[PDB]
Ligand binder design. Structure first.
Ligand code: CA
Lengths: 82, 98, 43
């Protein structure tokens, strides 16, 4: 039940300088998450301390409405590339 | 499409929100109202294992969370993503309480 | 990410890595002390 959140990363394999590693204080899964259908696949994590916001670290707005089909989006991660 | 390679450097991908139809055709009976498809039916470009949880940002707004799929980057098997726009109330309420 | 490119360093400032001994899932920073991710990433 243990998660360290790493902010300000680009190269996850090298400590670059800009990173803030903050442990999760509270982990809250959606009450209706269904592991079979994967319906409600969403979870909130409370950081043990606030992140410091700066050049390398910034929040992203929640949607003001749902998006039209055909909207271009940007998806990012360190997941498998093959 | 095949094998395993997990990067050191963060990866990015531009991809369009697919219409409900093209999303539901792809996964008959499996797409709920809390889900949207984003990606390409030709395959080749997709999120994959290790991307889960991450952002799908469109016009400066977090519209999706990397959720699931049938493998990654397969023809007619686009990524499926948690529709964040259904959850703003839950998110706010939870943040207020906690 | 399959068929993507390497992001410009520290573009995507809202992106986080969730780590339990190693990276396992991503997430997004939505205010200074709350990150949203996927319930199946629970650890
Ligand atoms: Ca680093």
């Amino acid at each position: 039940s243990r998660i360290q959140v790493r902010l300000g990363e680009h190269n996850i394999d090298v400590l670059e300088g800009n990173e803030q590693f903050i442990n999760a204080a509270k982990i809250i899964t959606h009450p209706n998450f269904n592991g079979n259908t994967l319906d409600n696949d969403i979870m909130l994590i409370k950081l043990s301390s606030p992140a410091t916001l700066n050049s390398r670290v910034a929040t992203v707005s929640l949607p003001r409405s749902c998006a039209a089909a055909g909207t271009e989006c940007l998806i990012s991660g360190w997941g498998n590339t093959k | 499409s095949s094998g395993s390679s997990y990067p050191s450097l963060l990866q990015c991908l531009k991809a369009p929100v697919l219409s409900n139809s093209s999303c539901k055709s792809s996964y008959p009976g499996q797409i709920t109202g809390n889900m949207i498809c984003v990606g390409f039916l030709q395959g080749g470009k997709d999120s994959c294992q290790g991307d889960s949880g991450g952002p799908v940002v469109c016009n400066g707004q977090l519209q999706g969370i990397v959720s699931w799929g049938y493998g990654c980057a397969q023809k007619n098997k686009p990524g499926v993503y948690t529709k964040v726009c259904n959850y703003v109330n839950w998110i706010q309420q939870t943040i207020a309480a906690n | 990410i399959v068929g993507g490119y390497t992001c410009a360093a520290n573009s995507i400032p809202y992106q986080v890595s969730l780590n339990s001994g190693s990276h396992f899932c991503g997430g997004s920073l939505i205010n200074s002390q709350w990150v949203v991710s996927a319930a199946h990433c629970y650890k």
